Design a protein around this ligand. Sequence first.
Ligand SMILES: Nc1ncnc2c1ncn2[C@@H]1O[C@H](COP(=O)(O)OP(=O)(O)OP(=O)(O)O)[C@@H](O)[C@H]1O
Length: 508
Amino acid sequence: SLKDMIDSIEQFAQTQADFPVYDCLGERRTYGQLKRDSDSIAAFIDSLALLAKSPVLVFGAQTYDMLATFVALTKSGHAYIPVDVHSAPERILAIIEIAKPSLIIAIEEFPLTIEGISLVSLSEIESAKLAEMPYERTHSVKGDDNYYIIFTSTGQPKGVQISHDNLLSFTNWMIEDAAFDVPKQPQMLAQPPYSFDLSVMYWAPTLALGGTLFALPKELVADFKQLFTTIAQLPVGIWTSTPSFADMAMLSDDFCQAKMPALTHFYFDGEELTVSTARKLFERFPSAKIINAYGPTEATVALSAIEITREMVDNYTRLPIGYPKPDSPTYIIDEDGKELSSGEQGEIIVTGPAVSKGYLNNPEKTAEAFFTFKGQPAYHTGDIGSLTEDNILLYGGRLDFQIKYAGYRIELEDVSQQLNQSPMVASAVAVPRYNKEHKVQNLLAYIVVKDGVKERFDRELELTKAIKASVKDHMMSYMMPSKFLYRDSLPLTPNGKIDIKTLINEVN
Ligand SMILES: Nc1ncnc2c1ncn2[C@@H]1O[C@H](COP(=O)(O)OP(=O)(O)OP(=O)(O)O)[C@@H](O)[C@H]1O
């Protein structure tokens, strides 16, 4: 039972000094090296004489130096704020205005100029490792101390603060959980950027269990042909990503058990995992375990998980989001805040030791979303779901996407997953068209169809009717959207999710 994240990696430094913690394409760093480098960087940090417990902004991609630096900031009592290299500069500016970092560490080159705050170069961070200064922990981040602050975009950005205690509640669960079923010294693909709290689903278990991270070069992240081929050469056992990223992977010929024989586990979190995605996945990898995991950043990465089965792919029309965690009581509530019994629909709220203390310096949004329930810190997820008698959590969608149409209670994500049932559809997004009144004139759907479908059909109209014919026996009549918008792929957010908002806007 994990007592402290640092202690763990300190132990792997004695116990397994020569085992690799990091790998970028055969270039490697070890647990012994991570201790040595992070100790030296911590000493560097203390020498700067910053405000105690002030947060530090760390700008970069996925290199070894990001991690070594994170660990140093932890050792030396400072929350880190991962900002990813591909961020809008106005966004980077926003984070700084909100968070008031005492320092910025530019692990990759920093494309803004602000006087006011100290800036530390990559070359400086390198020099520090190579100086090899020792380090004695005396004022490491503990208890409810901020460990990291991740920024969430709804439009305007907010900074979720996650404590050492929050992180340990998530991590102890992950590594004991029968769905996740994490192997010793796990060999984890490290695709999600550090600025997305999904990165935690790989670094925290890995470090807690003595594994190895497999990172990719930043210049490789836009070349989609090379990316999946390069990935396939890697001895990775676990794939951690958003469902979308794996849909993208599903185009490559090489994303199969044949070319990736070490890969046994898929960990998905962040957006709906689709029945089809799981289907294609099991074809490509018949033996692999698949895990859907759920939660907002505000409750430390994920609060429920469950293993997805073939029974589940053969029968369900939507995949469940799993067993809530023992230490995080989860509840369904109506619009007057009363707790409902199993099967009924309402907001998903979560409580307990993994619930963030709130957004940094945004007391208004904090007061909207965080509150106390049954004596315990709680968070409004904004999601509609339900809990079953056997305690499995089910996902309905976002409150902001429950709409009224022909005076109804329509969940957009329902129309989407209904349409995704059709054999000719890869990915479907139902979307509202408005008029002058902020009222709903009609439903539309964006459609991406499967391979060899576009070419069995001479005209869009045959296709649309063929599609509607394939799920009319299931779909209620008021829910079938009238118009389809075909696309070859869907836009994604920086974090790799289907960009529902932008899709809604491009029709209004
Ligand atoms: N397994 C899942 N299935 C369905 N939906 C999910 C799942 N996991 C997460 N979500 C959705 O993602 C939300 C969490 O969002 P998150 O904390 O990533 O921030 P965000 O506001 O979506 O933007 P960003 O990703 O940039 O932070 C949940 O509210 C839920 O709507």
